[PDB]
Design an enzyme around this catalytic site. Structure first.
Site, PDB file in Angstrom:
ATOM      1  N   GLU A  50       0.905  -1.336  -0.024  1.00 23.37           N
ATOM      2  CA  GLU A  50      -0.147   0.045  -0.096  1.00 23.37           C
ATOM      3  C   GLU A  50       0.760   1.221  -0.001  1.00 23.37           C
ATOM      4  OE1 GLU A  50      -3.120  -0.028  -0.489  1.00 23.37           O
ATOM      5  OE2 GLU A  50      -3.704  -1.994  -0.066  1.00 23.37           O
ATOM      6  N   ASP A  86      -6.924   6.095  -4.614  1.00 24.01           N
ATOM      7  CA  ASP A  86      -6.435   4.792  -5.169  1.00 24.01           C
ATOM      8  C   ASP A  86      -6.649   4.356  -6.580  1.00 24.01           C
ATOM      9  OD1 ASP A  86      -9.213   3.877  -5.821  1.00 24.01           O
ATOM     10  OD2 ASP A  86      -9.444   2.469  -3.995  1.00 24.01           O
TER      11      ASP A  86
END
Length: 163
Positions: A11, A20
């Protein structure tokens, strides 16, 4: 290595609100804020989680706290889910970690739908056909290198993909 180190890699750590792969508002370690395009919504959700008035910027410490909560949530989702608990229960620490990463990324619902491919990947005969299926998910297509890494971990039970 462990689940934490694993997601921090996959991440990354971000202190300012970001978007994202699906273009959703996110922060810290893969902490989704909202699916709306209302940056205000994201901000609002943020200050809520945080308490304070953040202005869309948090600290490493705050990010890390959210991170610990998010990993706990994934674990609970697993254990409450009728299809995944049994799989989880039977797994070794490395394949548990892979499974947590999937849930972290895609949610308990998404993952539970693949239960059968998961258990199949763990056999000797044609375990690869099962791997192929997930490749096709919307998952892999969005984040193909992360999908391979995670799938490799889940199949091998080693950290080779991390490396």
């Amino acid at each position: 290595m462990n689940i934490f180190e694993m997601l921090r890699i996959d991440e990354g750590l971000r202190l300012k609100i970001y978007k994202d792969t699906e273009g959703y508002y996110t922060i810290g370690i893969g902490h989704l804020l909202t699916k709306s395009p209302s940056l205000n919504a994201a901000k609002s959700e943020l200050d809520k989680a945080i308490g304070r008035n953040t202005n869309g910027v948090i600290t490493k410490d705050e990010a890390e706290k959210l991170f610990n909560q998010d990993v706990d949530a994934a674990v609970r989702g697993i254990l409450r889910n009728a299809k995944l608990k049994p799989v989880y229960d039977s797994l070794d620490a490395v394949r548990r970690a892979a499974l947590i990463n999937m849930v972290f990324q895609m949610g308990e619902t998404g993952v539970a739908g693949f239960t059968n491919s998961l258990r199949a990947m763990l056999q000797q005969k044609r375990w690869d056909e099962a791997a192929v299926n997930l490749a096709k998910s919307r998952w892999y297509n969005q984040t193909p290198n992360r999908a391979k890494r995670v799938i490799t971990t889940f199949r091998t039970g080693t950290w080779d993909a991390y490396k």
